[PDB]
Symmetry: C5
Subunit: 214 residues, 5 copies
């Protein structure tokens, strides 16, 4: 009936995945000769705690990571008109973006699952709680306090992975209104850094947040 | 013989799980062409802590999840008139339902097991302790504090996974009599979210709790 | 005697291979193959009673024991081995939970079971459980009282039956210098029934009367 | 060259590790017909905290375990004259020795790796942080306070696993000079019990620590 | 075309990793007959907390580790002129190197991935947070406190793994300027210790740190 169509779609999905993760090897990761661009964007849910005894602030946020792999492309016509699929992030290569000034291991607040689609684009959007080095002086004033945290590849330079922000403005829309702290401003900026060691540029995305007690 | 029956019974179950799990590849997940409906529900047990300095609350509750897969269906006459069986939750596909509001990784307080039966209905009922953003303010008065947390699939829209609920009434019959906090109202409310960007519905269940200090 | 030692080990490996490799792991109890599990508690310490969260922390040993026909053997075929120790991971274990725990149960002991030729299993693991309790009275003479129910999570009385050896919780191992004194501890079986759905459910109720020491 | 010496070096070890682990099953454990002697010795590094509110003390120490297995023996002449090698603690069998009074799961501060040598002796030294039941009362005085914690096999009796101890003196040579607590005495004593149940003796090693606030 | 080079790139590196890892057995570890030198280097980041009740301190740093294995070499010519690659550190051998005075299990703040190059050199650099035994006394003083922590192999002696440092100067350039505590000095120094038990040396690197409550 109509639900035989349900079967073919299940069968078609299995088949696509098989073609992708079994018939073909897992991605070795970007190389100088296969540079990759990773798009990074932040949405800030809560500032849970600002600790002036340890100088550590706790953020809860979503981090949108996306990038494209030719290895992940397919023609939806051969696979029953499937233009995408959800999958565990264990089954696909994921980038090593990390907070550079984490003071604690990051806690993952969301299922770790990615969306892949026919163009070979991947959307990974992990929700997480980060503790990072922040001195909150003046959080209780009106001018407020400001803390920065940088994100980027741990093991890869600009010639292998390239960071870009699609928007310079941090997304404040889902932030918690009844949170102890209120956001004056938050901005995600991209930078490039150099070392005498090597001529390769090293990108980071610097997250700057201004906030006060509420 | 009584023993011979116990024997056949077992073998039957092994064969049955074998047919589903070994012989067919585990279910790939829902698609638009093959949507899934998940029924949620909540049973309240304890509000353990309300933290005024961080604005977080600790809740201990049962979250009931149900769904149906044709893949899990079988004929009881085929396998010993077995109408249902228990299984480890890692043996079956489970839905990526998550509280969108959590401040700490959820902790599981019970075995992870699911009931499954002949028509392919899965029943999963994890006990959990959750910390989420809430404002305790006013919990020391008569009106109490009201807090809320949204649950829904993290990776899936309403055209793949659709959220539903038995009732709008949270189950308090199991709530801890001696808890530091007493519960005034508790509700589970469904809604669908729509974005500028996309035509697809994004459902959630909204758990709303009204609570105050016990004395 | 060396050879005798080598033959004892060969025998044990062979007995083990027959159960966990020759035949596939027990699917668990059912209506037509029900199981009885005996529970007995031994109370070690009450480490903390928190008045602010209404939580109590306990250290205790939980004796679980049961019979499985698939675990039987005739010692003569196997070098007169009448019992062995095994990793609890290797055998089906009943799913018994504290119903009113407020944290994940912490395991203090190696998880290892005793099996013998009649097919009886004995598993005792030391745990720290924190659960829902009202401490008030703990600073009085009469003392505070708390209770926790233990039973199966996903099985009913028709599949798993609960039973106790005695109604007397064992205090013989209870820490003398503990912050809290144990006035009484009882362990009582009860069956939960419904008008609605016809299958009994069991549980064992650990009730503890305790006060601050003087 | 001096390279060839290194290649045989590696190959003989890979070879030796394979003959023990791959071509032979893992040791089933001690039995009444095949008993094993375990040596337990302690070295104290720190007493981190005494908590007078819960009556628990937190201790950092090395626990040295030694035993000899016939199935770990080899002739050095036959592999490269290799008399010993380091392996992951998970590759071999380990005795299950536990603090009987621990109030939290133990935390390992060190890699888990053992040393094995040609006569079948194994030496395993995990650095651990343990919390055990102790009443700190008197730790602010001159006599200090005294606690004890028994270690032993959880699942095996004296006819299967035989506990012995190196010294009655717990090694203080590595203890931390600047600790909030000074150690007056630390001793490790072997002991055995009997039960109404059985004739088989149960050994434990009793670690008794006397300490007081340094100042 | 342009994308052809891309493929050969991907294929080449999958082939290289296959020859080293799936074709050859993971390295058995150093031996007295095949010893190894690991270099340690420290870059100090934050002293997060100093606990004067328990005398433990919490520290954040990067620890650079490098060694060389002949078994990890290749000719870049046979292999598309790949001169190095990134990999998970679970796929290679890593030295067991522990802070000896740790009071709580080390936490890792970064991805455990390591870089390997055609000469055979391996370079591994985790961020960690360490609780270790230190008495913060006179951290109030303008003169500060002083603490040290030892690092070495847990299971290996000096004839199997020899421990070295590139500079006796700890790298402070990445230190957090707004930290509760300021760094007066940090040194990293190689020690060697003999026991009666054996005539074999046991190396360690000592990290010595003098800090005080920051006043800016
Ligand atoms: C390998 C670990 N990795 C972490 C680093 C760390 O980067 C940062 O922390 C950082 C980056 C930009 C701006 C500020 C940064 N920063 C600080 O330095 C202080 C605080 C932690 C912070 O936010 C990421 C980028 C790069 O790795 C691809 C590094 C650089 C690559 C290259 C550079 O050495 C000159 C540098 C590394 O030192 C090691 C490498 O040597 C092979 C590295 O550890 C980081 O140094 C900042 C830096 C490398
Ligand atoms: C994959 C992660 N996922 C988590 C999200 C997040 O859900 C929520 O946060 C949320 C949902 C319903 C009601 C309230 C929610 N909420 C908030 O938004 C903040 C407030 C405190 C709260 O609890 C749910 C499921 C959906 O994807 C199935 C999302 C939407 C799908 C679609 C939507 O774009 C607007 C939106 C996503 O941005 C990603 C996609 O962009 C193509 C997503 O990350 C979440 O946005 C909130 C939203 C997607
Ligand atoms: C898998 C979840 N499971 C946990 C439950 C939980 O039971 C209890 O918590 C409980 C049982 C007896 C007495 C008191 C109990 N109790 C509470 O209810 C909380 C309070 C702190 C406490 O101790 C165990 C037994 C049974 O499952 C075998 C349950 C019952 C079986 C049946 C019953 O519903 C009709 C009931 C369930 O609601 C769901 C089931 O529907 C398939 C269940 O979730 C638990 O409800 C008590 C109850 C089921
Ligand atoms: C299997 C778990 N195991 C832990 C036990 C418990 O050991 C102790 O805690 C202990 C031992 C000696 C002296 C004092 C002990 N002790 C206390 O019991 C109080 C105090 C907190 C403490 O540390 C040690 C090992 C032994 O079997 C290896 C036990 C005994 C073997 C035998 C004994 O039955 C009485 C007893 C067990 O009950 C189980 C067995 O059933 C036949 C056992 O659980 C422990 O009983 C305390 C006792 C067994
Ligand atoms: C595998 C355990 N191992 C850890 C050890 C532990 O290291 C230290 O604690 C340590 C080492 C050098 C200098 C100071 C150390 N130390 C202290 O001991 C106290 C102070 C806080 C500190 O950091 C590392 C080096 C060596 O193994 C490579 C050890 C020594 C080799 C030899 C020595 O015994 C005579 C000594 C060991 O006792 C056991 C060994 O016998 C197999 C060992 O456990 C450690 O003893 C310190 C010591 C061995
Ligand atoms: C699959 O995913 C990628 C990434 O979202 C899609 O590429 C984007 O598609 C939108 C559609 O308008 C464009 O606006 C974007 O410019 C495209 N790239 C980016 C990063 O902006 C792609 O179209 C999707 N394809 C399918 C079959 O669904
Ligand atoms: C197997 O599982 C399904 C799912 O619960 C059962 O279908 C339910 O049956 C109950 C009892 O009559 C009804 O109240 C519900 O309306 C049904 N579904 C739902 C969504 O609640 C089915 O009855 C079970 N089969 C057996 C063993 O009787
Ligand atoms: C295996 O252990 C069980 C106990 O766990 C033994 O069963 C005991 O049998 C005796 C004699 O009938 C009873 O007195 C005990 O009550 C039983 N145990 C308990 C506490 O229920 C069984 O005998 C052992 N197997 C063999 C044959 O040695
Ligand atoms: C199923 O149940 C019927 C009784 O209702 C029984 O007679 C029949 O034998 C059972 N089927 C099998 C295969 O045992
Ligand atoms: C030990 O074995 C090695 C390698 O075969 C050999 O070269 C060496 O001579 C042996 N030692 C002795 C004393 O024979
Ligand atoms: C192996 O270690 C044991 C325990 O110390 C010892 O008796 C023996 O001398 C050692 N033998 C070798 C080959 O090193
Ligand atoms: C690899 O490592 C060594 C040590 O850093 C370095 O000197 C050598 O140049 C590197 N090989 C290259 C350049 O690819
Ligand atoms: Mg028959
Ligand atoms: Mg013989
Ligand atoms: Mg040769
Ligand atoms: Mg070509």
């Amino acid at each position: 009936k109509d639900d035989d169509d349900k079967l073919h779609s299940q069968a078609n999905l299995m088949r696509l995945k098989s073609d992708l993760f079994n018939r073909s090897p897992m991605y070795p990761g970007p190389t100088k000769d296969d540079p990759l661009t990773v798009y990074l964007s932040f949405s800030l849910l809560d500032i849970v705690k600002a600790d002036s005894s340890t100088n550590e602030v706790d953020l809860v946020y979503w981090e949108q990571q996306s990038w494209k792999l030719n290895s992940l492309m397919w023609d939806p016509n051969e696979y029953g008109n499937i233009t995408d699929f959800r999958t565990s992030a264990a089954d696909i290569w994921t980038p090593d973006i990390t907070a550079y000034s984490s003071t604690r291991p990051v806690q993952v607040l969301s299922p770790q699952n990615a969306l892949v689609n026919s163009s070979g684009h991947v959307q990974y959007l992990p929700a997480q709680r980060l503790s990072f080095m922040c001195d909150p002086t003046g959080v209780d004033s009106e001018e407020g306090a400001t803390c920065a945290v940088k994100f980027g590849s741990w093991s890869y330079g600009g010639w292998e992975i390239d960071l870009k922000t699609d928007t310079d403005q941090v997304d404040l829309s889902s932030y918690y209104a009844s949170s102890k702290y209120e956001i004056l401003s938050a901005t995600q900026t991209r930078s490039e850094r150099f070392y005498e060691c090597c001529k390769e540029p090293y990108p980071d995305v610097n997250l700057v947040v201004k906030f006060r007690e509420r």
